[PDB]
Amino acid sequence: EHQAIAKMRTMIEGFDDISHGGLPIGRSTLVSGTSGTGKTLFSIQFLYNGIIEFDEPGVFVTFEETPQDIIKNARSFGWDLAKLVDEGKLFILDASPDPEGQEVVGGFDLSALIERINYAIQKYRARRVSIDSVTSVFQQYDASSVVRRELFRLVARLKQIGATTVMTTERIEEYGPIARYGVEEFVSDNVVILRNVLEGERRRRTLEILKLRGTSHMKGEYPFTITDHGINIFPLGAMRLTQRSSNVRVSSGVVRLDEMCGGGFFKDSIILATGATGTGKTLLVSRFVENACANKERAILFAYEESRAQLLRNAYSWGMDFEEMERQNLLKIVCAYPESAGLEDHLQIIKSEINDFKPARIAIDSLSALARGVSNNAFRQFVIGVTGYAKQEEITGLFTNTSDQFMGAHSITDSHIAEITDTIILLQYVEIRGEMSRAINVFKMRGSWHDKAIREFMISDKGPDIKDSFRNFERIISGSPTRITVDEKSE
Amino acid sequence: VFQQYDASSVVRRELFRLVARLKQIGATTVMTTERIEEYGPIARYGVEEFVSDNVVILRNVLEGERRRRTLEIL
Amino acid sequence: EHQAIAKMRTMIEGFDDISHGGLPIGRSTLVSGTSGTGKTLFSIQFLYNGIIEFDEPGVFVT
Amino acid sequence: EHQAIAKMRTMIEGFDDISHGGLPIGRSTLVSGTSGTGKTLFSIQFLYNGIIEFDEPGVFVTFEETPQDIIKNARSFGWDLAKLVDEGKLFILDASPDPEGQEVVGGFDLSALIERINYAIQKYRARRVSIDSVTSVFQQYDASSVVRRELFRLVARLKQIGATTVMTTERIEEYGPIARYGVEEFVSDNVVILRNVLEGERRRRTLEILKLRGTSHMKGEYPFTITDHGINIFPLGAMRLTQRSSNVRVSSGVVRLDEMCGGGFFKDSIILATGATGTGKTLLVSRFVENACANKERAILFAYEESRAQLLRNAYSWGMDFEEMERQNLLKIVCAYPESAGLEDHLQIIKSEINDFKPARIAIDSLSALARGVSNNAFRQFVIGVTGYAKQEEITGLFTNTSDQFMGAHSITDSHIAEITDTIILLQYVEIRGEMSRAINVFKMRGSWHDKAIREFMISDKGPDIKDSFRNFERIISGSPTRITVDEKSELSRIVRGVQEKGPES
Ligand SMILES: Nc1ncnc2c1ncn2[C@@H]1O[C@H](COP(=O)(O)OP(=O)(O)OP(=O)(O)O)[C@@H](O)[C@H]1O
Ligand SMILES: Nc1ncnc2c1ncn2[C@@H]1O[C@H](COP(=O)(O)OP(=O)(O)OP(=O)(O)O)[C@@H](O)[C@H]1O
């Protein structure tokens, strides 16, 4: 085998993308982390995918949790372990001590065990072996140097055996040492770390490959999600810039608007409707989702500010009936505070749902309500995650951003998303004659021509009604106009 | 190698010998050492630094979830 | 000899530029880092380039 | 000299200033720092100089490094220690451990070393001593208690002996405890701390005198660099304010300007060129180096923005042949990135280049260039640096500063240097009827009268053309002025109809 390293895909949504193939075959991989990070899971799900997808029996070796439990719990993600032990496809090599015992059994067992292991490997024709909490073994009475020899005995042995491994390790500080003894670190051929960061009293799981000896991989941390279908990792960086682009158009929900956009919104594209509070962003959304119910199509609306009931209300008041929109299963409303989770868990829910309603249009009721309380670098990511998804998926995306300051705002956006958006719809207030009148403007469209003037507009029970530009005013943008009343040419 | 049951001093002396004998042969040598914190001690045992004529550090500085790799000549 | 110190080339793009010539002849250079930072590679690339470019035999201790 | 302690000069660029004269005779200075900080060099240089300048022999006790190498390396700076060890001016005392050693030896040998050293000193009649890396010795199996009593013995006996010793020590962290066992700091008379602070991936070494029992010294950190000549320090605070002032005046390279400046710039003065990007500072600088050459006087240009090539390109297109300036041996362009080393370094190169060329004029295009990344305090300190040298050396200086916000900048400093400067030159944009015109201005001159006008200017292959002022404009400085007319048509040259000729004939 004089070839480049060989990797054996994991089938853990995303791991194979970050590891450019996955755990090098026949070698040991170390997945360490502070309690509650995934570990136990990761290895389980490691074996599983290996069996139910390539018929590569697995050897699981616990050092504390009783086999009966590894099963019990596994039922969490909808998979009966008891079945593969019955079909002899996975062997849970119980290695946890019993209630009673003795001591002074140091390297004593570390040896006998390498026999019971080689045992089941040969016996069950194993290929994927996972040992969870190897650490919970030396936590008997050892020091660094003692550990580095008991571990190295094993791996060295397993490599010989020809089995590809995954060792579990526990850490105390999320960013301190890689493993309880800073010894495993250099004893593994590839190291993986499960980080579960606090910050904001909210948590964010993150997986990383520190190293993979003999191959390239993806440097850095990646957010992952523990759900019902196991671990899931979105390689938001990995995602490529090869989205499909069409010159086909789609209505805005507002005719006169469509006209301004010179034909409408391209199907494959992202639209952003910015404007002070009140301007009516949520309006435009509402109307943009009905137009996808007239052409009998499925679209979704994610609201993080208003409720289910109130939305319906403020919707029946504008004419459009969502009640029906729901019955005719062509429209789906979500609703959830931004505080009920984190961008990682959100980016997913959006994705997930999107797969179970096969939308054609989609709008999020306020991104800025989603950036509420989270670092920019974190939000700017979340968007690139939903923005790209919808993109390489042919779904037209219109999002909502409520600028922090009404009138005079010097930026369609605060978090710095305009660069990410294709078409920009800017609603602003305009103080004329002591009154707060509106205005709508297609700030920019990347393909079309769109209307260059700032057209005023009012809101009635019939919905928006775009009007005429303030041709005779100045400083419109600022918000506080000034009439020219130019005395003609004065005759 | 020192990861068997040794302490700073013992380790300090040992590098001295090793390195030293190697000096005698006339062999230009490059030694690899493992750390713990990207900026913490230069070498695991807080000794290897002063004992070597030349010191090179490879940092895989994290930051913003992105890792940056640097190399320095103390 | 009776002059400054003599260096060897490592032919590692950049390094030999940083080190003002490369590692010093007849001495041990300590390259230390955390898990997955370069070391071994740097050690290997060191020997390799030695052979493949001046025909300088190399011994690697693992 | 008023101090109560007789000091001895190290002859190390800047130390004897910082240490108010040098190391106290008959005592011991603990020079310690992290790794790659300068320690041994400092000791080596210490012995050296006492030998090359006072004919004071000296003993050098090496603990880890080999007696061969200490000579091998010293050559780097151009020191033939072998020749000194030969002339018996420098005895090296090898106490390094063995590649085939046993284990156990750091106490009775300490009783032995004292006796050993007492022999060298007595035999070589030495007046200076340098024990390098005492630390390594205890580094066999010891704790703070055996370190305070064991050093002490050495020091003390050494003191009786009458030798002015220097001891080196290692220490893990750069700002934490001075030395390893955190004990060497109190047994010593003096403590010198060498650091190699990181910060922004670059590296800044500094030297500091925590304490000199009995005298006074300069407090806090002072930046030093290691060159082919050894350690070099900048007492950027021992830089007294006593430079010469002369009402002498010199050319700017622009004659209408010289007017604007009461009759040309002052010789002893600091000139500050500030303006938004693209206004023309760079230019004025050129015409400044040029003129200093058209008068047969030397001057150096340190560009941190443009290349030596491109600097010549735009210079020629503006007239002035820099190609010749170089050959005639009147002008010298340096050119370098600020990211090619921290301030401490830059500040020296500049000095370097000013002693190997002795210019009478010097230009630094874009101080605000050097301010990249660096913390104000560090920049402001460097600015006082260059500025301060050029001020005590009759070396007129033209610094260029580019303001980070064109039109609408409320301070032509950004870094707040407008107090170090003696005279400021102001360039900026003026939106006049949909056009981006420039205008200059002489904001301040300490001793002159200068022109208070905000004259507009235009650039040609020929240079900075100084025209007239926007008398008929309000909110000038604002970038986009307002037109308010009381006249304009007013005389100056009314007479209508056919006033001009054309190209045929006049
Ligand atoms: N059905 C589920 N839905 C959502 N999250 C789950 C589900 N099942 C488990 N989890 C999450 O995954 C974690 C389980 O961790 P697991 O037992 O796999 O190993 P670990 O956290 O790596 O190590 P340790 O044994 O110390 O807990 C729980 O802490 C929990 O947050
Ligand atoms: N029936 C109606 N008739 C006339 N105007 C209405 C009616 N309903 C709402 N409006 C107008 O629309 C605004 C309601 O805001 P809308 O639901 O469009 O979302 P928004 O302004 O984008 O965001 P947010 O509600 O979070 O501030 C009111 O401020 C009001 O001026």
Ligand SMILES: Nc1ncnc2c1ncn2[C@@H]1O[C@H](COP(=O)(O)OP(=O)(O)OP(=O)(O)O)[C@@H](O)[C@H]1O
């Ligand atoms: N062909 C390759 N291309 C790009 N990067 C690689 C390649 N092979 C390995 N790597 C990278 O190098 C790392 C492997 O570390 P390496 O074997 O070079 O020694 P080390 O990090 O100095 O010490 P250790 O034995 O602890 O890993 C991996 O983490 C990976 O990112």
Ligand SMILES: Nc1ncnc2c1ncn2[C@@H]1O[C@H](COP(=O)(O)OP(=O)(O)OP(=O)(O)O)[C@@H](O)[C@H]1O
């Ligand atoms: N000619 C030179 N020009 C510039 N730098 C030099 C020159 N010679 C040596 N150096 C630098 O000087 C330093 C040498 O440090 P030195 O051997 O004097 O003692 P140390 O760093 O204090 O202690 P240690 O024995 O633990 O290394 C190196 O960091 C090296 O980069």
Ligand SMILES: Nc1ncnc2c1ncn2[C@@H]1O[C@H](COP(=O)(O)OP(=O)(O)OP(=O)(O)O)[C@@H](O)[C@H]1O
């Ligand atoms: N040959 C030329 N003819 C006419 N005008 C020129 C010529 N060369 C340059 N200019 C003008 O001079 C300006 C160049 O500025 P200059 O090189 O003097 O330095 P600066 O504005 O101080 O700093 P920087 O150029 O680095 O921003 C241009 O913006 C342009 O209007």
Ligand SMILES: [Mg+2]
């Ligand atoms: Mg576990």
Ligand SMILES: [Mg+2]
């Ligand atoms: Mg390693």
Ligand SMILES: [Mg+2]
């Ligand atoms: Mg709002």
Ligand SMILES: [Mg+2]
């Ligand atoms: Mg809203």
Ligand SMILES: [Mg+2]
């Ligand atoms: Mg290694």
Ligand SMILES: [Mg+2]
């Ligand atoms: Mg050192």
Ligand SMILES: [Mg+2]
């Ligand atoms: Mg030294």
Ligand SMILES: [Mg+2]
């Ligand atoms: Mg310039």
